[PDB]
Amino acid sequence: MTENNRLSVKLPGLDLKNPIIPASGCFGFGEEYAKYYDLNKLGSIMVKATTLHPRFGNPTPRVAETASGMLNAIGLQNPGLEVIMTEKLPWLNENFPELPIIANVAGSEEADYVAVCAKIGDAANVKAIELNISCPNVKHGGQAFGTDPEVAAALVKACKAVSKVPLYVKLSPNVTDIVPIAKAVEAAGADGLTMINTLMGVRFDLKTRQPILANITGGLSGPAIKPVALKLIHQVAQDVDIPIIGMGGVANAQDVLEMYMAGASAVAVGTANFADPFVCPKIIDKLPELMDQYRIESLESLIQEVKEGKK
Amino acid sequence: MTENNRLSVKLPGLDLKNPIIPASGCFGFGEEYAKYYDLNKLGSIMVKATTLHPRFGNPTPRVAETASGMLNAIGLQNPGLEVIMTEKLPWLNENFPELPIIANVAGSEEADYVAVCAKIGDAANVKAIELNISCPNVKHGGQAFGTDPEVAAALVKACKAVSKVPLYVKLSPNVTDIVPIAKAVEAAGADGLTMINTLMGVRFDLKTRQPILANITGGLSGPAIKPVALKLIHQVAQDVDIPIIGMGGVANAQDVLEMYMAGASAVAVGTANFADPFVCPKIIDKLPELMDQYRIESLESLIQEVKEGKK
Amino acid sequence: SQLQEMMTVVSQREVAYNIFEMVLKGTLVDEMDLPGQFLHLAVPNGAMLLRRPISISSWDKRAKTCTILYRIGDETTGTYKLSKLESGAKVDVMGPLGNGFPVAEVTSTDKILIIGGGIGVPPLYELAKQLEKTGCQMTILLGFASENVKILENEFSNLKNVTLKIATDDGSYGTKGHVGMLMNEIDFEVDALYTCGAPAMLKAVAKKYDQLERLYISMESRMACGIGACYACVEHDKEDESHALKVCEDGPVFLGKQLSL
Amino acid sequence: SQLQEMMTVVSQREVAYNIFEMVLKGTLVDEMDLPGQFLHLAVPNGAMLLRRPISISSWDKRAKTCTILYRIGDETTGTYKLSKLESGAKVDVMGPLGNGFPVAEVTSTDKILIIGGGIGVPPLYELAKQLEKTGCQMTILLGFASENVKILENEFSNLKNVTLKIATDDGSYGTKGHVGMLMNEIDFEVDALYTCGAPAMLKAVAKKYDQLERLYISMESRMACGIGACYACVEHDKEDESHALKVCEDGPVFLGKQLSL
């Protein structure tokens, strides 16, 4: 259990021993991957989305492969706030008391998000909230909260007022211009940003001529989308004064450093966990030597250098 | 030179012997790839964008690799309308008189597009126009014509009024909702649609910490984006009554058939040409046996079946 | 580490139309025990990130090898690329995984019924090998679409206390029709029925033997993580529709028709 | 067909720090003639679609083989994956490509100057071999960052009518400094100067020999198609800034400092 100061980064509510964080929905609540390695090795964990009431999710097939990526239409399946508050989070607190947890929150309307945000912070191990705003807003014809600056802002304001831990907002890449949404979310009180959530994709079965996913459409993730994430992160980095946790196709230590060059302060790893269960600890192990090669004394230093040498 | 009725498709101004068409910007004006194989094998060709005046394009580096894709910031380099009207198109007409040419048009303002559309149709071999609307509109702060239904519609209306061949409009995937733009473009007179143009991406050099592309951002293409293209094509197919030529990451005959399952009538192949110069003729050669496997009598039949069995 | 290893290809050959048998050697074999578990195989292509779940057909402790039988798709599929691997090649394997077939509580007195279909037959071989030891009464009904895709007949027939019955849809071999036909033909009180095959076949089996408690059904599903975290492979618990059963972790083999773990 | 072939790896070994020498055999060798052309190599990874442009270092007609010297990056790069290929492996090659070095109009009277730097040295070997026949006077100045990356010294020195001079930035071998130093040292009227190496080196060479018309400069650039259609590899024509020169098709070797085809 040897730590490394060169890797530690301090973000609102998050004192990370290293920047690697499994992405929401790709690590469950840590109970399965904990069998492969010691979770304390991680900087933090973005557990799957929690919703007020239990959610079974969408019908199957729920996933499909793509070139260097995958599609998923899981549907945010989870046991609900109660079970997560009484069973899932406590398990993590009991087995990994020192591991900070980032609680992903979802919902169909503002009322749902508010309910989860106000409560989830009660968990001793939950140190920050990540708002999944790619959800359809039933109060807006089904439009995703993340595709309207003003709608997203109001959601963030309400949530900020009831949250007991720093509030992070996961931005959607499915928009014409990301700057307005990011500016508005920051103006509304967000303590930080995470990006990006998935792109939208579809695969067709040639034999049935039907979509592979029952939901027809699915979220696209994996290395395929990394260029889009880097583009958006870099774009948002030029106009906000709050930290960004970057994600989207990160599969190795080189990608993590690339995320930093774009303006990220920490890096989440999702889809890659499915291909290699040990990807996160491998990345953590590899970072120091890669940093040596690229003349990086520490990640904290890098974040500052990138912030001042905007180019 | 054996043709196949099972592969031929009829679209406005386009009587294609087969659906395979090299995508704009990935085949130049056909002079380089003509050395590898007989261009008549192709269904048509979308030649690189033509602009009123010559354009040198953006500084270099202009390209970068990504997972299953690539980034390009060529900048629409071309010799200009005059040279294209007097040298490039005639070369194709002289060597491949029977090959219909789809003329890609670009510009910085409506006036530029109008000028090219009105003239380019003078070429005997130009049988249709493909409007590249992913260009920055200097008359709208730099906003791409393809990100505003009303702006795109006015552009299409003006162009339609001066064009002497059917007008196709290449839609951008970089939008929150593609339906409005597609509906408006169809309402404005477009004879057909092509989609999609590239997504936006960025790559960083770890040693210099600078973007790999001089332009910083670049268009993302290749298999990586195919799921996004299929999603958008299928989405637009449900709300328009004009044909769609689909493109985005097509690398084999299976992908072409997948494009058809999504609602496409013909299929363009861009980036894949760079990896395998013979990709288009290989695809054409392979289609019949693949269609046999999937019970497809003909592409014309498939287009109709998909159109009626919306699912 | 114990759940992941760069195994070594001992051999690989096509044993049926588009069906390959691969023999893998590695320390992971030692952790095998119950029949019905699977392996999550990484495709040797960087553009194909999702692992392919393949049932373990059998294994040889002493030899330190396990065997799998899998169907390939065209040149653009992952299995196709795997079928190209020759002896000596390495395969990134995750496993063994899942809850396999229960065999401990089986005795030489009770009569066991085993029904297999298509590519669902492979896992049933290790199960059969396993049960052979108990000296119980085994009746194996296997079905295939055609003769060119029939597999493991030799392996099964060469097992004592085993009565093998084979059928083909087009009747190009054995009895004509689906296993469902051979099933109605059996005459005896079955104590436990192990099954694996096409969905329609599982529905038919669990439908005819509804009152049977010792009904073990192995399922398939689209997967991603393969360990129970992503929830891609879900099924509704017949016992509680709200409860989700994960084929990869809770399964692949379960109890009850509409399914019960 | 004549521009693309699944060549066969005859051999491959690391000859310098992170520098591998691959020997390829195929019918494409027959179409080679002028030194300076390159090959567009496909990486054996489905996620890496762009071909890697690599200069031909030399070839053996009778043997039907060509050789290349290339530097690799880390485990995430394409060249790294190529360096793993062993004898017998196949490599998807496109070529030969580009306008190479002119050698026809060279005579045993004129004195030829050849300046190479780093990984730009490889193509200069075939050029040297070529010119050796003309029996002209050849003076080769080669520069490297350090001794561990020096290459082809044996090959060059073992050529008649050739005076080899080597330098290293840190002076860990030969003369200390950049080739630019050895260049100023030469004493004779050069008739033609062939060069290939780092940008800074080309700028220095074409700067010292501005008045020389027979100045052949081989360029590098980021490429995609590799045949002249996509326009990714452009340069401004010193003769007409409006005119774009394509390194892959017009080049890689050109005439004039700021460049002229």
Ligand SMILES: Cc1cc2nc3c(=O)[nH]c(=O)nc-3n(C[C@H](O)[C@H](O)[C@H](O)COP(=O)(O)OP(=O)(O)OC[C@H]3O[C@@H](n4cnc5c(N)ncnc54)[C@H](O)[C@@H]3O)c2cc1C
């Ligand atoms: C627990 C379990 C055990 C299995 N055991 C066997 C076996 O012993 N022998 C055998 O031949 N097959 C078996 N299968 C089915 C096998 O996993 C699929 O046939 C194979 O994954 C399809 O991959 P591909 O490379 O052919 O196709 P592609 O089309 O390239 O696959 C792309 C993606 O779709 C998934 N996929 C495609 N269709 C299938 C479906 N039919 N099954 C599951 N996922 C699908 C792939 O796994 C992958 O993630 C099993 C499946 C499960 C869930």
Ligand SMILES: Cc1cc2nc3c(=O)[nH]c(=O)nc-3n(C[C@H](O)[C@H](O)[C@H](O)COP(=O)(O)OP(=O)(O)OC[C@H]3O[C@@H](n4cnc5c(N)ncnc54)[C@H](O)[C@@H]3O)c2cc1C
């Ligand atoms: C005409 C020509 C001849 C060459 N001859 C040689 C040679 O003989 N020996 C040698 O060692 N190198 C040579 N190079 C440079 C070599 O092509 C690059 O070092 C190599 O392509 C980088 O690929 P990668 O797999 O290492 O890196 P990656 O980072 O994985 O490459 C990804 C993409 O960037 C491109 N790329 C990265 N940097 C380079 C740059 N420095 N050069 C060109 N494209 C770049 C790659 O080609 C690819 O498209 C030549 C380049 C050109 C244009």
Ligand SMILES: Cc1cc2nc3c(=O)[nH]c(=O)nc-3n(C[C@H](O)[C@H](O)[C@H](O)COP(=O)(O)O)c2cc1C
């Ligand atoms: C199977 C799966 C489930 C996930 N569910 C969530 C979720 O519950 N909440 C959320 O904000 N994002 C979710 N995402 C999005 C990811 O956390 C991440 O933003 C995206 O996949 C980009 O990273 P990756 O390319 O490394 O996967 C999910 C993605 C996948 C693939």
Ligand SMILES: Cc1cc2nc3c(=O)[nH]c(=O)nc-3n(C[C@H](O)[C@H](O)[C@H](O)COP(=O)(O)O)c2cc1C
């Ligand atoms: C190098 C390059 C140049 C191209 N230039 C154009 C162009 O001039 N006009 C246009 O409409 N699209 C252009 N595109 C976009 C493609 O024609 C196509 O819409 C996109 O790349 C999707 O197909 P692909 O994945 O098969 O390349 C260009 C793309 C590339 C990669």
Ligand code: FES
């Ligand atoms: S594959 Fe992820 S839960 Fe089953």
Ligand code: FES
């Ligand atoms: S690589 Fe496309 S023009 Fe040079």
